[PDB]
Amino acid sequence: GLKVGPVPVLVMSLLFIASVFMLHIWGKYTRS
Amino acid sequence: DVIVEPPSVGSMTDEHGHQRPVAFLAYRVNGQYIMEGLASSFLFTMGGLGFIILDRSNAPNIPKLNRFLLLFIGFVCVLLSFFMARVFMRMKLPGYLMG
């Protein structure tokens, strides 16, 4: 319930998008 | 595209078989698909605009919030546009910049 500033929300959102790309690349490398 | 009339996307196969769509024409520099050419071209335009917006951001008498927000967009467009282009070529030619 903590009050969060708008800019913090933006950075958290971007990290999630980046993580998904990392997971896919990691999936190919771990397979290979 | 008009003269050569290539397909938007081609097809490939493997031992597991089945028709993979293809976006990048591998191993021939002077050949392309419709989708691939437009995607690459957009990146080139975006990189140029990123500098211009950055230049406008430097003008005096801009609010604190406006100036910070404009700068973030300028760097994101420039960095992503340039970095992504290298990846596209690396896939098209596997030996690119490799020695």
Partner: protein
Amino acid sequence: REEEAIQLDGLNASQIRELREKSEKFAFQAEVNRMMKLIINSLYKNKEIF
């Protein structure tokens, strides 16, 4: 280049080629399948042939 040009009211040259390739290539894979079983099996263990 010409072997992949979209042909309205016609069948693209590349497409027909791919098609037959699937027929011939698929069948060839079946030969590997058959040999795989015969060798990799245990016949008498799975002796439903009795």
